[PDB]
Symmetry: none
Subunit: 498 residues, 4 copies
Amino acid sequence: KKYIVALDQGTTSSRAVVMDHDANIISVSQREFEQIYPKPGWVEHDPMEIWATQSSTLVEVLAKADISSDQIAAIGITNQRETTIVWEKETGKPIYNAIVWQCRRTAEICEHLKRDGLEDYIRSNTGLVIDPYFSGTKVKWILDHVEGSRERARRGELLFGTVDTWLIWKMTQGRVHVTDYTNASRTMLFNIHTLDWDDKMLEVLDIPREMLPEVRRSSEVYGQTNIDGKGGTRIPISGIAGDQQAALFGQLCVKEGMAKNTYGTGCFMLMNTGEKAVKSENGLLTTIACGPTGEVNYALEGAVFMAGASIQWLRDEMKLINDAYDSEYFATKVQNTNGVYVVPAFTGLGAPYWDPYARGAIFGLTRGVNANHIIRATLESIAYQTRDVLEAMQADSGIRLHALRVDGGAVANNFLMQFQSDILGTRVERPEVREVTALGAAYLAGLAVGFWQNLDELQEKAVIEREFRPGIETTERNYRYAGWKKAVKRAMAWEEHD
Amino acid sequence: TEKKYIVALDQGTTSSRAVVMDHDANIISVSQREFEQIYPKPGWVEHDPMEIWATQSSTLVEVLAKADISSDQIAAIGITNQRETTIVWEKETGKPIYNAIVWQCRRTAEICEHLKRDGLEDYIRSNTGLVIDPYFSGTKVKWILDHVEGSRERARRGELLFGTVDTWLIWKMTQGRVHVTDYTNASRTMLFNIHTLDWDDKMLEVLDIPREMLPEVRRSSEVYGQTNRIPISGIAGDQQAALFGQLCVKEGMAKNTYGTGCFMLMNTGEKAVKSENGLLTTIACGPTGEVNYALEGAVFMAGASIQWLRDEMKLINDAYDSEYFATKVQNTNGVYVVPAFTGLGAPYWDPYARGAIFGLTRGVNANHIIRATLESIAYQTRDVLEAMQADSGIRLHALRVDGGAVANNFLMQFQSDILGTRVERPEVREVTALGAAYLAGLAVGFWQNLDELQEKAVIEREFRPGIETTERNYRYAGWKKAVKRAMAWEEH
Amino acid sequence: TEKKYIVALDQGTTSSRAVVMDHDANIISVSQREFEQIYPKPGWVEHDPMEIWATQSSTLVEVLAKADISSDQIAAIGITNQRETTIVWEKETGKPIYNAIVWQCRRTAEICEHLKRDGLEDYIRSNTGLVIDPYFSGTKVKWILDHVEGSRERARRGELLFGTVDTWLIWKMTQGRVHVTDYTNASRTMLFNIHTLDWDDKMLEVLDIPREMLPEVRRSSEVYGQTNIDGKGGTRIPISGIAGDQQAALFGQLCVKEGMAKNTYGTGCFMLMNTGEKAVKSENGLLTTIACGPTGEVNYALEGAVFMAGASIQWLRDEMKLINDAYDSEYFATKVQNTNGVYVVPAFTGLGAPYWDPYARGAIFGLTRGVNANHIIRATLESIAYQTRDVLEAMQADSGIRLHALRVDGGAVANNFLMQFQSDILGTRVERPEVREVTALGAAYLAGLAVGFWQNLDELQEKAVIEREFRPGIETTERNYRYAGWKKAVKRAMAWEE
Amino acid sequence: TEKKYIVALDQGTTSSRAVVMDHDANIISVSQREFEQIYPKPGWVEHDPMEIWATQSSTLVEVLAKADISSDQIAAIGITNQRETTIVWEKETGKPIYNAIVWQCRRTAEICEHLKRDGLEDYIRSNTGLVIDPYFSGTKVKWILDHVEGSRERARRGELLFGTVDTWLIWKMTQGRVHVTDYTNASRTMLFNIHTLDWDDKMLEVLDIPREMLPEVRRSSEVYGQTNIGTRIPISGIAGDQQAALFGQLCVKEGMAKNTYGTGCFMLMNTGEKAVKSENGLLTTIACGPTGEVNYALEGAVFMAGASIQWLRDEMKLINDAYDSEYFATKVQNTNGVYVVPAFTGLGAPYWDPYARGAIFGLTRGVNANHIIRATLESIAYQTRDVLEAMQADSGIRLHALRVDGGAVANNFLMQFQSDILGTRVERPEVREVTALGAAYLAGLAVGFWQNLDELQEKAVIEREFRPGIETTERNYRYAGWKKAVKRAMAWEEHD
Ligand SMILES: [Cl-]
Ligand SMILES: [Cl-]
Ligand SMILES: [Cl-]
Ligand SMILES: [Cl-]
Ligand SMILES: [Mg+2]
């Protein structure tokens, strides 16, 4: 029973990772799935495509490595947060697509919450902001959309889950309907202080309590997946955390004030705040994180909706880059953006603005602007967003970072890391293993079954592959950023409300 | 011999053209010759007056040679040209004292800022019809006088001559015997009073321009002189020649010329309409070549925006023209592209605007952006048309169109739809040449008038608004929202 | 549970695929997974057998997960595969002793030169159906035994096993219990006697291949074994059909009677005609191979493959950059009424059937000053059709059968210009069916027959729909005139390379 | 007025050009104007004579307008031109009875088969210096007469005139007063005896060409007449363009050779006052001696050089004005095994195969547009090597340097590859319009603008030198592959 598997069910792909007791990566597999847009500003996934791709990557990562099922000591599950699925208990059939965290469809529902004066309650009790980001209003949308569904839900016929929950339920043939505190905290239906569902929110959004999973700590045996057969060895699912929380954990940011920024589909900066919730006065989120020994901690979070996804757009939709010839290649073919800024509000703006009516915009164009400039600006936007959240986080926490601890695939991009260093005037420390999300999920799972004894067993794993140090002075820094803010302001409030 | 043809010379911004027409105004022969655009620094635009002349004389010879027409056969020559572009030369030697400073040149921005700051916006609009912008010739003559040590005294002395391109051609053609312009050209200089139909003393003073350097100003249809001997008997600025060639000779008749930029003019009969909506008030030609007035607005980046796509975004070409892609999608998925690359002209006149793209989401693709870039041509045209309808209280039923881009059926239908207006595409596309020919021809009796020409003119296609037109105000609203965000981008 | 589905596994050259079909042979669900093409040196082509395995396994899990089908609802699995591609592994450990050597690999060119030189062309043709070329498996197995010191003695000792991709998959799928191939796949090895239907003693001798390494050879329709994809205590699903991909496509097109032919358009073209129960020896540069009759019994076929078809359009797009996408081909080609006298012979990797000239190289003819880009695009499309005629003239010449119709499949069949011109240049009707998944259908039919899911093919054939029929639109004179120039062109592309 | 300038008109295959130069032979002003290449079917090549006239008159007007030079300041005009290209027109009206049939056109292949069948090879080479090929004017004149019912009878009535382009231009510029040609142009017609220096009645009889349509043949440097462009300006120099280039390169003594890269490329060597017979597939033709008197040359004629680039740009769109052939070609270090045999219009010297058509070989999956561009450029150098070796064979001279032109086709990349493939230095004078210069010299001499070539000889031109950058083994490998490719493009087109 020699390995731990992390299932990392992402916004744009499903991945599976096999790790050994030394905590080295032995095998990895990834499968993409379709991003569905039924209209502009909407974002959907097919839950059966989420399941299929995640189940199949698990099969593939063992097959390719010639690992048999019975050698797996435990599974850890980590996932794209907020994304919302509602299905039939009896058949497993979804009643609607997954509504992705990114989708803006519930803006109008959000306006109602705000009009009803719920801002303070929601922040005080859930740590969250009123925005289409969070699951609660998505659940409402689906129930309002599917005639009869509310009554069925009362009848107990319909289940809600975030993606962790959908996955476990499918992996356990429906025996387990569960979530962890970190995922639950993103739903806007869960009280992050009492550590239970919040009845006022359920009342407000008219969501039957019967739909809801049990909520548990992120390091604990939740159940059995019969991937060694129904007659085989027991393979327990024993770690769950929302992906950004799992990255925080795998970065060993388990002490108050410790922070990381993950570069994925989006960008997400979290700082652990120990056992105490810190209120944001600067447009951030208060959320649940994982303590040293898997207990409930709190974090501050800045969520940026588009980072890597903007590069994917360049590739897949604008076809301005490809595999052979990536973004860093083109970007560095030019010395600046020639005045161009790109505000990547493809799905509205997240922290610290929270404007679901913002839409993607490009500024500063002249006749001598080419593709490389636009490319380069799209990349710089990742760094500019980060500064936005970093500054807000410093204000809320009282803490100035002397170094930015980063992870995610995009960190492989030297141009981006250096520009990030530059625009912040802070060093950036890049690690040798970049997919820290999966590692976090592994550690949680592993700790739960005693594969590891403690986390400090894992202290010496990470290697700072590179340190980036600022190559520009305050004046330039500050000038470039000022223009960013000019761009952002012009992108805001684009979409006409319902 | 028997004089069976009229010749139009159209000296343009990037090429010199010569066109030959018969009494039925059939296009018999056409020649086009490119010439160098000089950019000595960013935003600066110059021409070599000797290359303008050589390419204009050469195309005249070429167009006749190829058609086997001789001089004895030519009733008259009409002259039409890129306006505002400014030349200062030596009366004695015919030598320029500096390049032509092209209408596109932005070198006089500071002088313009000071004029406006000194409170002169109304005086200038009122008396010249113009906006205080580096577009127009006055500031460019000043610049040259200021640049060339000693010239202002030589100008006073009578040693130096000013001309727009019409004046320069005609002077060269008459070997210096005729120093003349028409009203339409003069109206573009910012030195001419459009009401008194004479040079404006106050402008000459504030810009410090000696009166002895200026040509005589005459009708657009009058025999001005001769060239080895053919009568030269028509002159109009190019956009005014196009308006004429479109036979827009009655109040309320309008055209749009699609090119690198768009130039829309509407005839306002014999009365000058003062703009309060960001347009130009200018001189035009009435039915018999007499002074009429017009409202005008130019969109500086139209065709140019597609060229950006071609060459810089490199998203398109000859194989793959914009219409190909545009039509791969049934809309822009909420995208608007404001190609304010050089700022915004009429009706905004914001030099600080820069180009921008709006409404992006995850599923937006290159085709939506290509489409939206084409659409912008139609939106910017709407901007001008709304202004013109506002200034004039004339709501158009139909717009006459010309230029290359009129061939683009997608664009013309979208244009009709976004306007709610018929768009009339003519059979005979050489409207600038026709305008100049008609002028020249009237002047010499080739035609007694324009009635039969009117009668026989054919519209090759009329676009009318489809049901998509009912969305035009929703769409347009999004556009105006985009323009507002592209404005005032550039830091002073 | 009611076994309502058949699954086809279609392990291809560049991807592994899994397809689910119901009793009406509706396509219920498809999955496809790419795997790495290994090019160790120019001309050399490898696959990792563990990647083939992992991707094929994973897609079968994926296709059923997405469709919500469980293993107990599968009546049978049918297997089809990229032919000739060769694997040698250790029986004991399941470990390959070397990468798969793909059909496309040219490494054995010198072995083949020596076979020819040693006079064996007729013996090889008469007994195996095959041409002496690196294409086929036998020399590949020799290369591996030669390369891997000691391997032939272990082979003798029954320690090493040979398989084509069918054989590898089924051995993996049966946990090593079943080492089998079908007649179609075996016929491609150059070690199998197509007349005695046993491994050929002389071939095994000449190539010094131990008979102990070779699988048992069986019908293309017959239960071979059982796989379990659930694990211990799971369902055992019958594996009950096997054909080489091109044969499966033949079968799928229901070309089960003498005279019936199909062409599959892809990167290459693969053309086969059924010759019933009797083998036709080629005098005209074709292959004689084993195929499947109406009840999955041994029939024979003539075959010829055009190696560059679709690939030539890929060249126009990627290398010449004359189009943005392949799909635009027909659009450009049709902007002109003809090619202005141009022919394009895309012999980029030599010429396959009917020529078999590895030394040919691509060439373009008939250029004059007024020849433009669309003339060249149009000619490059036309080449596909011309190369097709080369093979079909040979096949008529070999068989004496002038085709009633040609059934077509593959992406390019969507190209009506191409399909019409194909009809035209052949003087033969082209039949485009409503089905596209003809390889997988073929493998499905064979599996289904074996387990009695279908009693026979009678109603599949009854219910079979031709979606488009192209009829020739030029006379004999013209088609013959045009062809003669094509022929003149090919002759000058030949024997180019030193 | 002081007559301080000479103008030369260089009416080429692709464009008409005018150049105005001073007494030091410095170019004051140049203009070039393209015109349509008309292909009524593959293999055929035509020009509109009225477009030739128009673009040539316009450029003349343009150079002077530009430079501000009046007619009374010009001592003389010299005329040079694309050779062989044939025009027949109506004397009374100036109307052509058919397009110009360009030298390139292959339409008269069948007429040439008959000449060949008739055993005329030797007669034609002995008397005209030429090869039986559609290249030359005579068969093109036959074709036009044959084509236009009643034309022969009109011609005998004096109603129809024949001219090469020199003749057409001078006729047009003199309003029909002068119908003339020079020895060099006439030599290219296959109707003119290069030894007796008069029309050849056997060739006229055999092609059934009425003597009445022919112009007068004169010295290449002599006052022919004058044109009002106003003062009448002396027209006083005419040479075929490649002979004018030879003259402008100052190749006026025996053994002096050059290669001019244009639409096509053309290697000529002056052989003084003696005609040398080619045994190696070249032409014997008329050239100009130091005072513009009759000399002889050997000539290698390559049909497609610059034109192959035009094809790339204009028809294939593989290159553009902004990014040129040298730009792309240099993006790759070789052609990845590709050869382009640019027989777009048949093969010239030394092969003389009017049935060849353009062909590309050696294609593999990794061959890209850059390899093909480059290979197109290389073909220009390979064809040059073909003619150079023949020329060495015919002349008995081993060249130690190739003297080339300074025009637009003779780019750095090509010049370096030329050197490499030859194993000889290439010398490129920084002279842009060497053809026009030749024509200018001729005209100037005629009017005494210059007294002789002496002081022109002493003008130190900048000259660039390229040295061989590869070794024999490679050179010879590369060239062998070329020959392999040529063979396979030969004999492509089915005969009529
Ligand atoms: Cl369980
Ligand atoms: Cl006068
Ligand atoms: Cl079994
Ligand atoms: Cl004369
Ligand atoms: Mg076990």
